[PDB]
């Protein structure tokens, strides 16, 4: 069960940090809406999280497009929680407006094809999954360079439009 | 031999249309340069090729950045040639500033993970490959929605910057 | 499930260009009639398509013999359509009086034993299939040399005669 | 080891009737020449052998084209010999200008894909094999209808022309 | 394969009986002894005195409650032509025992007489009783023939023992 | 492994009773001569040995034909010895002019295809083996009915004649 | 195979009892101790003092509630003849214990005493209790025999232990 | 897997030593006793008193000829941040023993402490001698901690017995 | 094999309890903590001070709701004789804990302490809770022993915070 | 690798008690002599060792015949040692004139076909092995009943005699 465009997205149920407390998040929870699943390699890394912040700030634009953004990493929910509790002035992430999923056992990263087995971390993959659970897009960047928030919005708007016309 | 970010890109040698005549194109030919390999499902399809045109028009901007754009489809070099000879006024593609690769035996599309076996055509995948032949990016869109030329430019500039800093 | 003389022909359902528009063609559609399935790939090749034209021109002679000619290639229905829209003066095929079947996923060419896997194209095979769907003849030519239209007519006439005596 | 256009023809070594006596015939014997190998289901069958006669009569036209015609069946060299010794007025074949190969153990017919296992006889297959031993054509007719001598001549001439241009 | 004491392999083969084709099976002779004898090849350069000897004794076998059947790996058409070609002219002439065309070799294979590399049957002879059990097997190399009286002696032997 | 007409006979080396004492008999010992190997179910059986006696009496006729007769059973050389020491008046065999081979471990009977595994005894098989060790004849009778001595003589004479040439 | 503490392999074998044949199985002696003893060959050049010793003690075994059975790989006809040949004349003479003909070797194989290459049983002796459980195994190479008193001692031993605790 | 009396599974893992990264292998301590101790998660709601107790006794171990190493399935960045976050503020504060980031789980798998379903290590502790042989294994469920003096006692025990 | 957090491998083994044989299974102690400890050989030239220490603390374990069990790959007859041979005379003397004879090695194999090549158990100790879950594992090489107080501390620990 | 009459005996190398101290005994050590290998289920069992004592007392008669008697059990060399140190008055074995082999890992008992897997003990098997290492006899008694010393002497004398004649 790897993830491929046109196929059903691998299901998941993962403990996540939502507004500073733990919640069990599954894909089935968002059935009917678009989901944008986006991975990041490590918490507390020496790379500024501008990428997660950009998606956090656009949370509401996604919600208006009928979509929910979810982030995911191979850190525990405790590491990710602490990451949010450590403000940005002090080198952390600060609170955020999107769930952060703790993929400690690596199943998520493996099923979505982004895990770097030797290293224990996910590549910067991003998947857009439609209301019926079909993957309609895959981006995967090496770690050095980030993703564009507007691309995800453009694509979601694109797939909605085509969902409700010919194509 | 599938394609993965951080791994060596699958090599290939495919007959392509360059400037209305055939040339054998391999990836090894572009070692030292960034390569942006982009697939498209079918020639002569009744869907406007604005996507290939946008990348054709930016061919030279990529070249200036030290990158080569390559397009690829599961059509023969003769179908792709005829596509270029048929102007856009008349429902074709017109000439183009980027090699068009004929993946008739499907090996390319299979090795890069974009082939839809049941259908015989490639998804709209796009791969950025660095000078050492390592895949640094993968985009794959379902057919209904296209790719953004500026994303490929942004990413290439991104990977160059990080290559040197 | 390969094709052999005396055995049931591999069924198929393939999108084809008939009179400049797409139609889904299966073998089951011609049950009761002889079918003459002939392969060619490639479209827009730099070789004059005299072979397809000869069979196009004899379309009606086949129809009189109780047979339907079908052509087939590993090109898409869009490439094949464009081939017909491009007239012969300009290096294309022009319209034709026989369906052109797009075997893009190669299943047809594989099941009929004509695909050159390394290359992605069909050899110049021709199959005559009787009303019950049994293969009664197989021709397969390497690419350099073509088929004779009259052979297919002669064979069909032959198999009809023997169908109704023998 | 089945026979396919573009591939090497299955080698063989079979006892045949040549000019009313037995000789061991192999394909390797005709290397350098075109070979037209043609099968028939049964000797003494109730079908007139006009087909074998037509190819026998054109023997020399084939020889002029640089080709050798060979016939083959699943009968013994003794059955095939007797067939030639029985003249046509009397319901046999009469003498012929082409070797008749006795495929009693069925290996030839199996390797060339014409054997009907349940029945023990070959379909009316015809193979044209070039000087390097590559199969350039395959015809296979059900038993009720025969082959055209001129098709084989046309094809051989065709493949020679294309061999040299 | 066929073994003494075991059930004989069943068969259904096209044969030449009185110059026309008939489908012969073993099941047809259930209740009688069957003496199945192989020979291939037809038109071979070796005189068929052996088949003639068994043809001439056809009726002695019938009196003993037995049927003789011959078999070869030639087609029914080759075997037919063999009978139509008289002996003056190097053939066999008519015969009073069915000639079975084992073209697909199944019979010869099941009875263990086929020479696979060659496509021909050894000179095997099998005596099969009324219940279909093989009570005797002879197999000669091709160079030397069988004795008709041996088959009669053996059949008489097995009848006697069948009833005491 | 098994014995077939036209093939090399399975070799053997078996302890046998010859003139009231033991000797190790192999087939290799008779190379150059015809050998007629004949099996019998058991010693001391309630069946009169008239069959072995007939072949014993014709020993010398076989020798004149250039042949050696050998008999064989699945009994030990001690059982077979005792069989010969027990005269016929007293229900035994009496002495005989042909070696009697003790196939106790069943290898011979298995290799020659006559063993009845469930029972441990050989069928009444008879094999004629030529000077080069090739099997030229096989007879195998069910137990109820015996073999004919003259058939073996006729066959041996037959195969010699045809051997020469 | 047979093992101490495990159920003895069942059998049904034709045997010589008082000069005639009877079918002996182990199931027949359920409720009694059975002492199954093998011997390599009949008519062997060794006087069978061992079988005689067990024959003479038949009645002491019967008094202990035990039955002695002997077994060999010879036919019932060879074994019968062995008994009919008196000891003065090199045989066995009659005996007071069944003699089992293991011609197909199944018994000797199942009890682990068969010497495959040779076709004979080692001098094994098995004591089997009323429930059919093997309580002892002796197996001697051929050169040296068994002691009758050991079998009696062991049976008495196992009875005693069967009835105390 | 790791077993008493057998060679310990080798490793080479990025670790936090004095606020910076160093690559730590077992081969680095050949000649000394190594006490390898796992803890399930950084920043967990459970007080690290256990790591602190072993950190405080670092020098007693060093005097005995032993090196203590800690290991978790967190990244070196999570573990670094854990040390930079003082205890007043819910972290670990600095420590006197390397903290090894077993992100790919190989270490925890090879030492038999990984809970596959969960992605975390049990509280295992292994004592490994100078030749790299495992001479002791402790493994505690999550609810209850380890005793520092046991590890010191055992190391002293194995040294004494090493020299007798 | 036996693992912390998993159900302990069941067993049923003949043991010496107060100089006579009894069949001991784990199921017998369901509801109580069990401390199963292995010892490699009886009559070995090393001191049983370890078994004595646990024997003397038998009652402290019983007060904590726990039963100590010892186990070795010796027969119940060797183990019995070990207890009948007093310590003055180089044996063990009586003891207040069952001694389990794992002659067929199944126990030692299932608990992961058997040294196959040798036929003896390492000095493993397992604490098993009332539901039969393993909550602790110690395994020492043969040269060095276990601490009685550790087992008491751990059991008290797991009772307090139950599960 | 099971033991059978006429076949090579399985080799072994086992720690044994010889005269109250440990020694490594292998079969290879007695090549050239007959060996009489005899098993016993358990030390300190409630059954009197009369059988081992009878063979111990005849040790020297065996030695004079050119044979060595060896005993073997699945107990450790320490259990077997203690067994000898415990005199017979006090329910033990007392010293003995034949090596006692500790088959703790069960390899010996398994290779000679006497191990009762479920139980961990050897049946009362006895094997006579000739100077070339060939098994010339096998006795195996269930546990309830013992073996006869004179049988082993009779058999060894038997096999020697026949070794050195035609008959």
Swiss-Prot record, chain G:
It is found in: Cytoplasm. There is a cross-link at residues 13, 88, 131 (Glycyl lysine isopeptide (Lys-Gly) (interchain with G-Cter in ubiquitin)). Coiled coil: none annotated. It is an enzyme of class 1 (oxidoreductase). The keyword Cytoplasm applies. GO terms for cellular component: cytoplasm; cytosol. Induction: By peroxides. GO terms for molecular function: peroxiredoxin activity; thioredoxin peroxidase activity. It comes from the Eukaryota. Thiol-specific peroxidase that catalyzes the reduction of hydrogen peroxide and organic hydroperoxides to water and alcohols, respectively. Plays a role in cell protection against oxidative stress by detoxifying peroxides and as sensor of hydrogen peroxide-mediated signaling events. Can act alternatively as peroxidase and molecular chaperone. Oxidative stress and heat shock exposure cause a reversible shift of the protein structure from low MW species to high MW complexes, triggering a peroxidase-to-chaperone functional switch. Homodimer; disulfide-linked, upon oxidation. This is Peroxiredoxin TSA2. It comes from Saccharomyces cerevisiae (strain ATCC 204508 / S288c) (Baker's yeast). The lineage of its organism: Eukaryota, Fungi, Dikarya, Ascomycota, Saccharomycotina. The gene is TSA2. The chain holds residues 2 to 166 of 196 of the full protein.
